[PDB]
Design an enzyme around this catalytic site. Structure first.
Site, PDB file in Angstrom:
ATOM      1  N   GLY A 112       1.882  -4.979  -5.220  1.00  0.00           N
ATOM      2  CA  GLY A 112       0.517  -5.096  -4.368  1.00  0.00           C
ATOM      3  C   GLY A 112       1.222  -4.816  -2.756  1.00  0.00           C
ATOM      4  O   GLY A 112       2.277  -5.203  -2.632  1.00  0.00           O
ATOM      5  N   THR A 113       0.314  -4.200  -2.034  1.00  0.00           N
ATOM      6  CA  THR A 113       0.916  -4.054  -0.503  1.00  0.00           C
ATOM      7  C   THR A 113       1.035  -5.661  -0.036  1.00  0.00           C
ATOM      8  O   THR A 113       0.037  -6.386  -0.275  1.00  0.00           O
ATOM      9  CB  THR A 113      -0.360  -3.389   0.329  1.00  0.00           C
ATOM     10  OG1 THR A 113      -1.390  -4.237   0.406  1.00  0.00           O
ATOM     11  CG2 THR A 113      -0.657  -2.211  -0.456  1.00  0.00           C
ATOM     12  N   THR A 114       1.914  -5.625   0.805  1.00  0.00           N
ATOM     13  CA  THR A 114       2.319  -6.955   1.451  1.00  0.00           C
ATOM     14  C   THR A 114       1.177  -7.399   2.469  1.00  0.00           C
ATOM     15  O   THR A 114       0.575  -6.642   3.264  1.00  0.00           O
ATOM     16  CB  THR A 114       3.634  -6.967   2.184  1.00  0.00           C
ATOM     17  OG1 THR A 114       3.828  -8.257   2.767  1.00  0.00           O
ATOM     18  CG2 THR A 114       3.918  -5.865   2.879  1.00  0.00           C
TER      19      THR A 114
END
Lengths: 233, 140
Positions: B30-32
């Protein structure tokens, strides 16, 4: 069904060219006893809308919490909830009219009389009133309970029809409203000297003031009246 | 026996639940998204990945707001975090309705944790695949 205990009072409202002016006192009445003076009757939701209601104090607090929850819901996942999209008076008005209707139809209504004053994003003024029974109508001048047949004859002279709205200034509206409030304090037992006045305007924004009393009251003619009748001295 | 990862409530021989581990492994894809606890408050941050330029800039957002003072930033299965923050908003609304005090952050944490674990007790519910960096400012 229920019997209101701590009854409210009249709330006066009337629109002008640049906005709407609403006013109310600060007094909670239990029967013939005037219990609370710090009770607030105007709850400004957002910046361009102010709602003024009357009835049972528990009921105004319930409606106030409903308004706060509505604002919280509107704030959700809305990047434009601050400037572009806003809780315009029409939305909240029909929301609380709907909830009033559901309360009535369930046969446990809330003794209330709600007046909402606001300015549309396009500049049009909004002013409408709804009671516990759910009757809705928009007039240049509205009042509540005792004030309904009391404030209207005063506020309707300055503005009577839609053509009168652009011709009335904010100062004239304010002086008419303060004269009306003086008359109600003279002739209504459920009001106090202290009151609250709110001014909404599409240019200067919301103007709300606290700790406002009734001045310029004449009483020197009451010492020339002696007796209840045939008595002279 | 095999199939110790097919169901949810089953315990592995070493005592570690397996569907939760797979959910954790799904979280990392997932996106940081970071969060800094400054002295006065909190500062969230997200790295929403720009796909093909058809996506409109500065419109899709991922920092969801709860009440006024609680913020939620999520990574992993974005919809699952959407639902989690929805339930959290409902809990905060109920608390403010029946206590009229804004929900304190540890209380919101307790509510969200109890909801999250409620989905890793049964065999008829998939564990959440979202990790949140929710925080904010309260009275204390």
């Amino acid at each position: 069904t229920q019997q209101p205990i701590v009854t409210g009072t009249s709330v006066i409202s009337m629109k002008y060219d640049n906005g709407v002016i609403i006013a109310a006192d600060n007094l909670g009445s239990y029967g013939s006893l005037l219990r609370f003076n710090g009770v607030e009757r105007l709850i400004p939701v957002g910046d361009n809308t102010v709602v003024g209601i009357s009835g049972d104090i528990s009921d105004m607090q319930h409606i106030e919490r409903l308004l706060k929850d509505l604002v919280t819901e509107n704030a959700y996942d809305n990047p434009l909830a601050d400037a572009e999209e806003a809780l315009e008076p029409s939305y909240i008005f029909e929301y609380l009219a709907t909830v009033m209707y559901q309360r009535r139809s369930k046969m446990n209504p809330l003794w209330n009389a709600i007046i909402v004053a606001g300015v549309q994003s396009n500049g049009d003024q909004f002013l409408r009133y709804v009671n516990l029974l759910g009757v809705t109508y928009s007039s240049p001048t509205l009042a509540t309970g005792f004030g309904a047949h009391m404030a209207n004859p005063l506020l309707r002279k300055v503005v009577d029809r839609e053509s009168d709205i652009p011709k009335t200034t904010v100062q004239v509206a304010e002086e008419a409203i303060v004269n009306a409030m003086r008359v109600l304090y003279y002739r209504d037992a459920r009001s106090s000297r202290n009151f609250s006045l709110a001014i909404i305007d599409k240019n200067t924004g919301l103007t709300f003031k606290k700790n406002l009393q009734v001045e310029n009251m004449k009483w020197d003619f009451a010492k020339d009246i002696k007796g209840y009748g045939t008595q002279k001295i | 026996g095999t199939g110790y990862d097919l169901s949810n409530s089953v315990f592995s021989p070493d005592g570690r639940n397996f569907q939760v581990e797979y959910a954790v492994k799904a979280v990392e894809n997932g996106t940081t998204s970071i969060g800094i606890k400054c002295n006065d408050g909190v500062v969230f941050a997200v790295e929403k990945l720009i796909t093909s330029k058809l996506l409109v800039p500065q419109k899709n957002v991922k920092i969801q707001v709860v009440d006024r003072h609680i913020g939620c930033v999520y990574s992993g299965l974005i919809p699952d975090g959407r639902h989690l923050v929805n339930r959290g908003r409902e809990e905060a609304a109920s608390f403010k309705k029946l206590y009229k005090t804004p929900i304190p952050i540890p209380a919101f944490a307790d509510r969200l944790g109890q909801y999250v674990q409620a989905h890793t007790l049964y065999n008829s519910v998939r564990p959440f695949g979202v990790s949140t960096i929710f925080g904010g400012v309260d009275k204390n």
